[PDB]
Structure 1
Amino acid sequence: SMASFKLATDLPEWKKLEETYKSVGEKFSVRDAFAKDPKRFEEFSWIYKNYDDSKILFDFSKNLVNKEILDQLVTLAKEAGVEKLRDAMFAGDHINTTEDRAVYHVALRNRALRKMPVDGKDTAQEVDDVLKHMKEFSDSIRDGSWTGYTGKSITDVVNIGIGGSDLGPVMVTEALKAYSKPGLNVHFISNIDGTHTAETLKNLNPETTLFLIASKTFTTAETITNATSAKNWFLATAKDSKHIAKHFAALSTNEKEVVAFGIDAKNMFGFESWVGGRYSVWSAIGLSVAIYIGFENFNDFLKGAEAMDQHFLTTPLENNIPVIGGLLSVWYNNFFGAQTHLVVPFDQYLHRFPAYLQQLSMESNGKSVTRANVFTNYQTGTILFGEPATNAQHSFFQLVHQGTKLIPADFILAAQSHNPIEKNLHQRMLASNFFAQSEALMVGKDEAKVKAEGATGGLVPHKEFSGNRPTTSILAQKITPATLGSLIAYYEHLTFTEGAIWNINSFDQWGVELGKVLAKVIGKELDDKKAVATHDASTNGLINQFKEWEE
């Protein structure tokens, strides 16, 4: 086995952390910790400096953690060989053991052109060549030199893809929308549900719309179905297949399929097998971002990830920010038994950031088998969810404050808004909520205070707050491309750390296969007339009721 251990439960520090949980962690008072340690904020906060000298404060000090606990977690990370696995990742080793592949999204943002080899062959130029092609193409869309079949500049660009071929481009174009150009819009078709195509294309002009079909194989069923429907929409107006070439490009490897579809092979933008879908927005898959906000902005976004990569690679564990966040996740997941991880951006542009992180985290770390090819009998990936604040405060934060579940939470705010309207009034209000919510989760409100505030009798307990509910606060200066690049890479490397401790392979996804195969079988049965009796009674029942109700 390439693995140095079999199960996380084999590592000696695991039982020590179980005993620390019992003695110190279960009943941990964050209030008391601040009272005990005047330097607590200093000790449990870190400033990250980005390549452009901008900064991001990572404040972990309201978590259920102290020096003793964090030191034990760092010892666990050493026993798990986090650093060895990380170094092997950056070395190009095939640490995706089940697919026998490198894991080399870090090579996508190698703008410094460090030597970064796979199979002993540097990748730096091959990556950089695709980025230069991306710059050329995106520049031609943005400056009007690429025209549609009637000689008009492009106004709308539609990405068609599923999974990692959609969610990154969506989230990042939403997040960086302040950097867009009036009159050049992006759209994202992903669902096979034909609503998604019908509603997206309804008001678009075939003469000025450009499609990017995002699929490595160019044989992905939902994506190629969507792509074919979009091609039919285009041709309903254009009425000649020769026009396809001015309106369709591919984010793909499969030149025979692309060319068959009517796309000029010159307009295929490739990426390698060592790019995982949920780690792919840094690749050719990011073309829609480069078109929307310009290549130089996209490049700055890459350089922010690169800087965080360098932090992760070169920092001792006890000061390594993505490591610390991963260690705290393990602490809550495996010792407190918290099943979820909340992420709340106090930022409307970042409204799809939690959904992006949900794929990154859950698709990576929802695994039950270790690198030693044995079943875990301990918890692995958490369920990650969230919505932006302040909206979230009005809604499920009720349960975060007064429910019976521990919900570790990360709050994210920019000190500066891209839209500082009304002399920054909205922004000072937004910021006050950021600070106040984490404060309230810590401090709570005891029975005496509820009484002082005027409640009596049976009403009193209903108005109490436990406090000692943990948050991590992440304050950026401004959510620029660079900042966003660093923030995603933070979560990539947090996700890495978690998976390394659990000894899982964070980079495969075998779990998609069964439902795909079973869908193909059923699809054939939905094409046929007859009632079905080939499945369990529920599946048969559902299919047969559908058949009675369908068009």
Structure 2
Amino acid sequence: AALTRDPQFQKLQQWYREHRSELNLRRLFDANKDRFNHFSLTLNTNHGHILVDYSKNLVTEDVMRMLVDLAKSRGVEAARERMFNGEKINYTEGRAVLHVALRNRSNTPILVDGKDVMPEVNKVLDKMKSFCQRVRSGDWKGYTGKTITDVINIGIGGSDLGPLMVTEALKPYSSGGPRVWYVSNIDGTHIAKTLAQLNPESSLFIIASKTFTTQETITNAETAKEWFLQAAKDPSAVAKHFVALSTNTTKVKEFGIDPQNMFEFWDWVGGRYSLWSAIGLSIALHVGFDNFEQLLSGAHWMDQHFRTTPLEKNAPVLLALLGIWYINCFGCETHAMLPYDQYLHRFAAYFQQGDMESNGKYITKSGTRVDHQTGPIVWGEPGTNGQHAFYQLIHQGTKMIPCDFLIPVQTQHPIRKGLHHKILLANFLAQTEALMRGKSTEEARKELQAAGKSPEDLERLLPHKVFEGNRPTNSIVFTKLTPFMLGALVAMYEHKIFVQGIIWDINSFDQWGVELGKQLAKKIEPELDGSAQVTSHDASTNGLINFIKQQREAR
């Protein structure tokens, strides 16, 4: 595969084989009091600063140089330019990759097949702005003349996770907006428990689906429309309560949706990169279009940082390279994302899709199977909650787990004269310090003697109180989690994912891996109907189906 044959990758491997045991963070920090300055970036966006502190990583200046040389050798800069120039870098689907055009506040032309996309982008944005103002002002009324109080986004995957994560993160900015609800699961619990809390007269449903044929989304959409019409009766009332994020005008009209309330997007918007498009309509409804534009503008800022900054100082590149080091050299299967911010409680879950569906791949551009690792398993919960759930394992288990710790300097809720945020910050800082430093046998012994333990007591407990440390982390600290700042942070990780995928020589922008399960579910659905035993699959699938049929009729 391309990566394994790359001479800079082999150089990196050889260094790792020879020098791994020099990489002790305590020793590295004791030997270089300038280490923070050498291995951190400060970004001034003009709308807050971002400090990317990567100094608690198992790197030296030589390792960083080797990693930048690998990004050069693997052609990261040229790939980036192909992305931004509208070239068809989604090569298995023959498609451009232009989430960057969605937020191109400069309106610099970006051509696909020699035709600037920016006018179509801005046309949809202008329709979003108009519709948002009509709904939020009370001008748009439901079928009995009431203003909209609840907006229900129905969609799966990329049509769900981004808008949910952002409206959760930007909840303080929703004054004057309707409540937002997200229905994604086909499990009928999800739509049913949502509908039970809503009034049809004042609810607006947003059906998010390019095809308007997606099975889970359209089934949920049909269930919502049945509930709605059980109240309203008149099919013409659907057009006051249902809009579409889609291009299938025919299916949209057939559903009962006025086609001027179809908000379009394009094939070069991947679902897991789509919150910047029409898919973000629920964001703009909730926090207002001005704040949605701020979200776009932050992403645009980070797009320019990624385009103009030398690789050795380029935040998404450096994040990507550190990840390559831990994945392909240390062999770490996972990457933890730990935001110390309750509003970001769905941030890690968003990047499960964005990272794992992008880079959970094993065929390269040439059709060759990889012979190395690709994307990691991403996971996490917000701090400080995760501290009382799983940090025991991060500190004292048998797994090396690279962690990104993120936090805003300024809280949206400075209650108690700042006391809560002060304690939050202190834990953010202490945890990465603890992971780095650990606590030696001698240090733990001293503590146990001071506590008065008997000599046999102390020797018993002592090994359990030792922290081996040397556990690496990134700390990402930013002034305040505003719409602009969130946009910049999300875009940063988008470009990290891109850089990693170029290095591995995979297509970060397709998802052929979802097809087999879809095909097999369609074959099973009709077999569940009626009471006959099923024999057409492997013995386990049959056995499960026949247990299901047996237990359908248990009291």
Matched residue type, 2:368? V
Aligned ranges 1:3-82 → 2 under 5 Å: 6-50=1-45, 52-82=46-76
Matched, 1:101 2:95: yes
- CA–CA separation in structure 2 for the residues paired with 1:148 and 1:53: 38
Residue of structure 2 aligned with 1:143, choices 137, 140, 150: 137
Counterpart of 1:465?
Answer: 467
Contact 2:44 2:50 in 1 (8 A): yes
- CA–CA separation in structure 1 for the residues paired with 2:35 and 2:462: 32
Counterpart of 2:148?
Answer: 154
Counterpart of 1:534?
Answer: 536
Q: Secondary structure at the match of 1:531?
A: coil
* Change over 3 Å in CA distance of 1:27–1:193 after alignment to 2: farther
Matched, 1:111 2:105: yes
- CA–CA separation in structure 2 for the residues paired with 1:250 and 1:128: 18
Matched residue type, 1:362? M
Give the deviation of 1:372 after TM superposition.
Answer: 1.1
Matched, 1:199 2:193: yes
- CA–CA separation in structure 1 for the residues paired with 2:14 and 2:393: 29
Matched, 1:496 2:501: no
- CA–CA separation in structure 1 for the residues paired with 2:21 and 2:488: 33
Contact 2:88 2:97 in 1 (8 A): yes
Aligned ranges 1:219-230 → 2 under 5 Å: 219-230=213-224
Q: Which runs of 5+ in 2 are unaligned?
A: none
Q: CA deviation digits over 1:13-56, x for unaligned, max 9?
A: 12211111122235511111112222110111101222x44211
Residue of structure 2 aligned with 1:232, choices 223, 226, 232: 226
Matched residue type, 1:500? I
Contact 2:40 2:51 in 1 (8 A): yes
Counterpart of 2:316?
Answer: 322
Contact 1:312 1:322 in 2 (8 A): yes
Q: Secondary structure at the match of 1:477?
A: strand
- CA–CA separation in structure 2 for the residues paired with 1:17 and 1:530: 60
Contact 2:498 2:508 in 1 (8 A): yes
Counterpart of 2:306?
Answer: 312
Query: Percent identity among equivalent residues?
Result: 57
Matched, 1:249 2:243: yes
Give the deviation of 1:81 after TM superposition.
Answer: 0.5
- CA–CA separation in structure 1 for the residues paired with 2:177 and 2:65: 53
Contact 1:252 1:268 in 2 (8 A): yes
Matched, 1:361 2:355: yes
Give the deviation of 1:380 after TM superposition.
Answer: 0.3
Give the deviation of 1:111 after TM superposition.
Answer: 1.3
Residue of structure 1 aligned with 2:158, choices 135, 144, 164: 164
Contact 1:47 1:58 in 2 (8 A): yes
Matched residue type, 1:475? V
- CA–CA separation in structure 2 for the residues paired with 1:323 and 1:518: 39
Counterpart of 2:365?
Answer: 371
Q: Secondary structure at the match of 1:138?
A: helix
Counterpart of 2:414?
Answer: 420
Q: CA deviation digits over 1:342-401, x for unaligned, max 9?
A: 000000000000000110000000000101110001000000000000000011000000
Matched residue type, 1:468? N
Counterpart of 2:486?
Answer: 484
Q: Which runs of 5+ in 1 are unaligned?
A: 1-5
Contact 1:25 1:65 in 2 (8 A): no
Counterpart of 1:549?
Answer: 551
- CA–CA separation in structure 2 for the residues paired with 1:343 and 1:283: 25
Matched residue type, 1:24? H
- CA–CA separation in structure 1 for the residues paired with 2:43 and 2:155: 34
Counterpart of 2:331?
Answer: 337
Give the structure-1-normalised TM-score. 0.98
Contact 1:109 1:303 in 2 (8 A): yes
Matched residue type, 2:137? D
Counterpart of 2:388?
Answer: 394
Counterpart of 2:437?
Answer: 443
Matched residue type, 1:17? L
- CA–CA separation in structure 2 for the residues paired with 1:484 and 1:416: 14
- CA–CA separation in structure 2 for the residues paired with 1:484 and 1:501: 26
Give the deviation of 1:529 after TM superposition.
Answer: 3.3
Contact 2:244 2:263 in 1 (8 A): yes
Contact 2:445 2:462 in 1 (8 A): yes
- CA–CA separation in structure 1 for the residues paired with 2:222 and 2:103: 32
Q: CA deviation digits over 1:128-159, x for unaligned, max 9?
A: 11011000001111100000000010000000
- CA–CA separation in structure 1 for the residues paired with 2:82 and 2:75: 11
Q: CA deviation digits over 1:391-439, x for unaligned, max 9?
A: 0001100000011100000000101001111111101011100111111
Give the deviation of 1:467 after TM superposition.
Answer: 1.1
Counterpart of 1:3?
Answer: none
Contact 1:107 1:123 in 2 (8 A): yes
Residue of structure 1 aligned with 2:174, choices 171, 180, 198: 180
Give the structure-2-normalised TM-score. 0.97
Q: CA deviation digits over 1:173-230, x for unaligned, max 9?
A: 0000000125720000000000001111111000000000000000001100000000
- CA–CA separation in structure 2 for the residues paired with 1:447 and 1:22: 28
CA root-mean-square deviation: 0.9
Give the deviation of 1:113 after TM superposition.
Answer: 0.4
Counterpart of 1:287?
Answer: 281
